[PDB]
Amino acid sequence: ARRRPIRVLSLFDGIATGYLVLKELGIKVGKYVASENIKYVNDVRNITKKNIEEWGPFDLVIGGSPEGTGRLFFEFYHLLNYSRPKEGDDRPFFWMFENVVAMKVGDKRDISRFLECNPVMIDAARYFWGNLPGMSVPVIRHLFAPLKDYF
Amino acid sequence: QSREQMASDVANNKSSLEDGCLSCGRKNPVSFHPLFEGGLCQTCRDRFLELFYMYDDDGYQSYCTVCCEGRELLLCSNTSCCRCFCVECLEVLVGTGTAAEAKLQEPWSCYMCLPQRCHGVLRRRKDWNVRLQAFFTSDTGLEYEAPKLYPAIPAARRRPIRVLSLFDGIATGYLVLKELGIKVGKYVASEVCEESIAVGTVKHEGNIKYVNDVRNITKKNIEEWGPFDLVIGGSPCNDLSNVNPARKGLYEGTGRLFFEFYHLLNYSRPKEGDDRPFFWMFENVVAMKVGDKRDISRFLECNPVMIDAIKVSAAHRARYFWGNLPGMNRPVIASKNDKLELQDCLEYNRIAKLKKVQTITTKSLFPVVMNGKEDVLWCTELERIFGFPVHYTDVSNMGRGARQKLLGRSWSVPVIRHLFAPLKDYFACE
Amino acid sequence: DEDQSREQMASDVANNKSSLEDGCLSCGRKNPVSFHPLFEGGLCQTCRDRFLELFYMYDDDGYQSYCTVCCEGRELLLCSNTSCCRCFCVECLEVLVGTGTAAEAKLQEPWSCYMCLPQRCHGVLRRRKDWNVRLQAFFTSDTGLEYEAPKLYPAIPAARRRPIRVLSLFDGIATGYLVLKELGIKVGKYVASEVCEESIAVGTVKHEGNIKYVNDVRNITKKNIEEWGPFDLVIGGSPCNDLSNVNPARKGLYEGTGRLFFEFYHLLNYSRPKEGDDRPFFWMFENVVAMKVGDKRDISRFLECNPVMIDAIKVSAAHRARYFWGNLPGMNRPVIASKNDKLELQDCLEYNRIAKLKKVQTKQGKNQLFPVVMNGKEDVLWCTELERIFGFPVHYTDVSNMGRGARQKLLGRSWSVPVIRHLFAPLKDYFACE
Ligand SMILES: Nc1ncnc2c1ncn2[C@@H]1O[C@H](CSCC[C@H](N)C(=O)O)[C@@H](O)[C@H]1O
Ligand SMILES: Nc1ncnc2c1ncn2[C@@H]1O[C@H](CSCC[C@H](N)C(=O)O)[C@@H](O)[C@H]1O
Ligand SMILES: [Zn+2]
Ligand SMILES: [Zn+2]
Ligand SMILES: [Zn+2]
Ligand SMILES: [Zn+2]
Ligand SMILES: [Zn+2]
Ligand SMILES: [Zn+2]
């Protein structure tokens, strides 16, 4: 109990649907930093370590790619390492990635190896990831429905 | 805003060339030529950052020395000079009528082969030799912090350097370490080529623990192989280099293996609260695109240095050397035992037609004549140029096809010996 | 008595009605002019004249091309054991041992030759207890005429010695020069007649051009020798390409490369001195053992010498026997291995490499592909190992940026350092040393 509100470092807002579903979920946000209420920061190429140190911490990361996938994914990973908690910390942490199943198999092997986590698949299908307790807007609502347990 | 009126304006003894783009014409410049006096626009200096160190298959410079472009290029035929000029560049600056002058003047001498003055407006710099290297080393992207100075660990407490290596090749890193005298208490490798393992095993008495491919090393392997004290690494320089029209960038192709150096760099680097030294190293070809010189140094969070082998060897080798080695930005001093000239590496009763050999690719003019007969270089002479011991690749029945390809993607021994010199302040030598 | 089947003689020796030395061991004919060097028996005129030629013939995969007894290729049966390659044919096995044994022997897997097996009277094929010492003498004496023993030159005074003015006709890769330099004999001049441009590079870069070259041998006249003379030693060796019986379209002497023998003879006649002399003079020659006996007779008649036979396997780790003519002091001493001889294949390999055989013979798949095994994958010999096998100092042929085939071909047709060292050892007694 006694849970502070959420702060999500989203990415690839696009239509900014994720914020809409999060608001409809019945929980409030503390600070949202999006990049294509939403406090825009920069382009994807202009975020430094001291920036995340100053505005940290964070509790959510979002992927998304409906072209070179590595261009976006490796910056995503870069940040993901930036936002992840250091040693001696017990703060809850989340992450999540979205990618179409129509993709290279070697690509898939590489991303699975780099994220050090086995992937999951949800039919429409879209390749899915994420260290989150739980097992297309309806898909978004279904996925972040159980987010209210620890918040 | 053509260069025609710009040259006339500065010819009136009332204006300078640094207010405009010498190779581009437009005003609003950012920086200057390191070869002459003037300035360039922002989008026009980027192309000079890449193409300066290119060379053609004919042993001569690839593109223009003024504008770095040309449909046709007049070529200088002096002694070991490769600069090729542009057709329209000459008449804009030095004066009109030079098209038919150099055509009939055989041999032609370019403006860096003769004592030059303000011929037209071609004011060659008095000390362009020293200011050219600063055009490639000291740029300003984000001004990262100075390298952390690990405390100088004295003797009687230094462990043998537990080296790690990715894409080892022919154990170039191991060879230099034994030359310095640093005891290699453990040396993992990451080579996959069949012939490369043969060279590193028989020559080194089986002291190298060749293990496996890079894409199979998992998180658990490092803690059962470590702790490590250095992480060497050299990426495959064929993904995005300005020689293959494929143009497979860092984010698409075998350039993906750069992050695999960064990936394994995170596991090996010490956890928070520990106070032990941990050095690392990286290098790639200088002739890469614009959007990679800083991205690789952004993820690494460091400032690249540049070292050229022409000051310590008889070949043209200059690459970007990342890392935080102790005292790495110091100037490139030559060695007394260096084979500074080609004639110190040739066989008996052979003489050369050049002084410094230009770059060599998968396909090897002819730089040697013996007994008054025209010949080419031998595979046992390339080893002396790169500082390797003689009869080093004579293993596993390779002729000239493999002893040349395998030697064309290795590091210069006296160049690497420069960086690793201060490592004796942290590890037990001899 | 002569043209009958082998059954009569087999029964006669079975019924104690005759002796082993009465009939030919390979055809049954009478008149034992010689003795079989491996068993008890006799040879006729038309049998031993094809046993001096085809005994040292080997196949392309390291085996014997003809059976050990009849030397006729009708049907073969190979000794499966390694370190031995001698094989017996069908008729040579069935008649002289026992009927019905061929099928059982073929079904007997693995099979062993009777020489590998312990000696017993398996039929009438009794094995001589001193076969080797008699086989060695089978190839050197009892043939041809009895030429007068060469006269030894008088003992040269120790002080009055001069550097040797060699003329190494058909030098190759300066094998004789390498032996002389290693032996410790002062060379004051060294001529050479080679037309192999790659070999010129090897002889030039390695020995600092100390040897004065000459172009093709076919363009040398008397005046050249008059200018270059005197000559304290003449050396030569014919290219054993067309002389050997390996090629079906063999020409032998008097044709092709055989004619070069006449060039060597003329060059030796020109360079040898005149009457009323005291200058020491020595010469030498070499050709393969496997050649026609008639050509060997003509060569031995022209030169007036009885050739000796030296087999490299007694000091080296290879199969190589070749004839030696010449005049040197003591060409038929018993050979002894040196204290630094690489006698077995194990001493001529790389690191992390293991040798399975012990002495290598001179379709390259699954049979010759397995001389050396590394990490469970058997492979072939390297050039750096051939250089060690042949006795040359290591890293010798690696010039002119040539790879595997050129190096091995250039290495396969040369001499061996220990054999020529043994031959040239007594030469320190006439010329200046060190
Ligand atoms: N996936 C992979 N795993 C291990 N090695 C690889 C590899 N992909 C390429 N390599 C090898 O890595 C080498 C990089 S070239 C670098 C040579 C070496 N680092 C030196 O400077 O001496 C290439 O020759 C290639 O054969
Ligand atoms: N027509 C010719 N004239 C002169 N030399 C010849 C020749 N044909 C072949 N040769 C040389 O004769 C040599 C035969 S190899 C035999 C030479 C010596 N036993 C050694 O190898 O050390 C070859 O090296 C070849 O270069
Ligand atoms: Zn410009
Ligand atoms: Zn130009
Ligand atoms: Zn020039
Ligand atoms: Zn007979
Ligand atoms: Zn037979
Ligand atoms: Zn046998």
UniProtKB/Swiss-Prot annotation, chain C:
Interaction with the PRC2/EED-EZH2 complex: annotated segments: 24-116
Annotated active site: 240
The enzyme's E.C. designation: 2.1.1.37
Zinc finger (GATA-type) stretch: 23-53
Gene Ontology MF terms in the entry: DNA (cytosine-5-)-methyltransferase activity; DNA (cytosine-5-)-methyltransferase activity, acting on CpG substrates; DNA binding; DNA-methyltransferase activity; transcription corepressor activity; zinc ion binding
Main location class: nucleus
Record note on modification: Sumoylated.
Protein location: Nucleus
ZnF segments: PHD-type: 64-120
Tissue expression pattern: Ubiquitous; highly expressed in fetal liver, heart, kidney, placenta, and at lower levels in spleen, colon, brain, liver, small intestine, lung, peripheral blood mononuclear cells, and skeletal muscle. Isoform 1 is expressed in all tissues except brain, skeletal muscle and PBMC, 3 is ubiquitous, 4 is expressed in all tissues except brain, skeletal muscle, lung and prostate and 5 is detectable only in testis and at very low level in brain and prostate.
UniProtKB keywords: Activator, Citrullination, Disease variant, DNA-binding, Isopeptide bond, Metal-binding, Methyltransferase, Nucleus, Phosphoprotein, Repressor, S-adenosyl-L-methionine, Transferase, Ubl conjugation, Zinc, Zinc-finger
Regulation: Activated by binding to the regulatory factor DNMT3L.
Catalytic activity: a 2'-deoxycytidine in DNA + S-adenosyl-L-methionine = a 5-methyl-2'-deoxycytidine in DNA + S-adenosyl-L-homocysteine + H(+)
Binding site for S-adenosyl-L-methionine: 171-175, 194, 216-218, 413-415
Cross-link Glycyl lysine isopeptide (Lys-Gly) (interchain with G-Cter in SUMO2), sequence positions: 206
GO BP: methylation; negative regulation of transcription by RNA polymerase II; positive regulation of gene expression
Free-text domain note: The PWWP domain is essential for targeting to pericentric heterochromatin.
Family: Belongs to the class I-like SAM-binding methyltransferase superfamily. C5-methyltransferase family.
Disease: Immunodeficiency-centromeric instability-facial anomalies syndrome 1: A rare disorder characterized by a variable immunodeficiency resulting in recurrent infections, facial anomalies, and branching of chromosomes 1, 9, and 16. Other variable symptoms include growth retardation, failure to thrive, and psychomotor retardation. Laboratory studies show limited hypomethylation of DNA in a small fraction of the genome in some, but not all, patients.
Function: Required for genome-wide de novo methylation and is essential for the establishment of DNA methylation patterns during development. DNA methylation is coordinated with methylation of histones. May preferentially methylates nucleosomal DNA within the nucleosome core region. May function as transcriptional co-repressor by associating with CBX4 and independently of DNA methylation. Seems to be involved in gene silencing.
Name of the protein described by the UniProt record: DNA (cytosine-5)-methyltransferase 3B
Organism the protein comes from: Homo sapiens
Taxonomic lineage: Eukaryota, Metazoa, Chordata, Craniata, Vertebrata
